[PDB]
Amino acid sequence: NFIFDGSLCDKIVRASGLEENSNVLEIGPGTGGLTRSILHKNPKLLTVIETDERCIPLLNEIKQYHPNLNIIKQDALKLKLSDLNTNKITIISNLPYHIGTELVIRWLKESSLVASMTLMLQKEVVERICAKPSTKAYGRLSVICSLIATVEKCFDVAPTAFYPPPKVYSAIVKLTPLENIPNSDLISKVELITKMAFAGRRKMIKSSLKNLAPNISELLAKLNISDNCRAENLTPNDYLSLASLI
């Protein structure tokens, strides 16, 4: 699903708060719509990660007029931000619908290298990114994002914005790493703990985490959490606390 809408691409860049002379990363630039909007703000470097062979010739052509365009042909799931050898990365990107959630978590894990992220995703995923505890969409993604970033829903994007059109609504979300973040060790554990915890909504934590932590009832008691708590009942901080004891 390639983005057209020229004005829409400019609105995403405006929403990002991108200033001149920044260091930008874009994934899956496709046919270049968002890419050109980014380049209109005169970044110091725009790095794009693209594998679709069909798309590169136009990207090579763009580079001919924009020497600050850098093109990398690699799998997005295989890129570490640390591999780009730059700091203060502003990520402005549409995400491929197969891997959006996976990329967001990967980037947040390397939040130290990140200025901000303004991302276009399925709206269903954006509501999960932004969900608060004891809300319908609260889940693993909410937990991970909440521990690491200030998250902000910007606006909805209709299927007609793309060619060909997707069947579902996209939306734009902005994520700005928090000034204080937990260490990477604890986040890595939270990532796995929440995959088990949220595998089913009805499951008590003392059941879902029992294989991992046979003494889980003891740990819940050490944290003064109900022995009968279920995953949706625990806050993001509760999961961090658990990670530090498992």
UniProtKB/Swiss-Prot annotation:
What exactly does this protein do?
A: Specifically dimethylates two adjacent adenosines (A1518 and A1519) in the loop of a conserved hairpin near the 3'-end of 16S rRNA in the 30S particle. May play a critical role in biogenesis of 30S subunits.
UniProt-listed NCBIfam families = ksgA
InterPro entries in the record: KsgA/Erm, rRNA_Ade_diMease-like_C, rRNA_Ade_Mease_Trfase_CS, rRNA_Ade_methylase_Trfase_N, rRNA_adenine_dimethylase, SAM-dependent_MTases_sf
- Pfam families listed in its UniProt record: RrnaAD
The terms describing its cellular component in GO are: cytoplasm
Q: Which family does it belong to?
A: Belongs to the class I-like SAM-binding methyltransferase superfamily. rRNA adenine N(6)-methyltransferase family. RsmA subfamily.
Provide the binding site for S-adenosyl-L-methionine: N1, I3, G28, E50, D75, N94
Q: Which UniProt keywords apply?
A: Cytoplasm, Methyltransferase, RNA-binding, rRNA processing, S-adenosyl-L-methionine, Transferase
Q: What organism is the protein native to?
A: Rickettsia bellii (strain RML369-C)
Can you say what this protein is called?
Answer: Ribosomal RNA small subunit methyltransferase A
EC number from the UniProt entry:
2.1.1.182
Catalytic activity entry:
adenosine(1518)/adenosine(1519) in 16S rRNA + 4 S-adenosyl-L-methionine = N(6)-dimethyladenosine(1518)/N(6)-dimethyladenosine(1519) in 16S rRNA + 4 S-adenosyl-L-homocysteine + 4 H(+)
List the top taxonomic levels of the source. Bacteria, Pseudomonadati, Pseudomonadota, Alphaproteobacteria, Rickettsiales
The record's subcellular locations are:
Cytoplasm
Major location category of this protein: cytoplasm
Q: What would you give as a GO molecular function for this chain, any one? A: RNA binding
